[PDB]
Amino acid sequence: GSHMNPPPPETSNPNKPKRQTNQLQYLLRVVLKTLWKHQFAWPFQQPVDAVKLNLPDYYKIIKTPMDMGTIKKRLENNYYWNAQECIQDFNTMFTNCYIYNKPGDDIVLMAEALEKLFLQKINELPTEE
């Protein structure tokens, strides 16, 4: 919990209206479940600890951080109003990785594997019931 890392994204706020939808249930039970247990998930399971990794420029570059630990908390503590908000958090996580890291890099190949699974699952996101 270094003072040099920012506070994580919000996962609890009583002022924000919340709703359970069948699409948000799918995102937790199918999408997050699938990606969390992937061999390459672990770099994405918590906020980037730029101190531990000796990357002092990370939060100079990435101004909208997101990770699957935060998404999991948001889904489990239903923070979201709709599926689009959660889909945007996944998209942000992937795009941050591709912006910060070189296209060669192991971390980018890991994110691409997770994004390929993600796209397959989101194409099947159920009709809002």
Ligand SMILES: CC(=O)N[C@@H](C)C(=O)NCC#CBr
């Ligand atoms: C989620 C994410 O982008 N993590 C990054 C910061 C990471 O682990 N870097 C790989 C390298 C070397 Br320089």
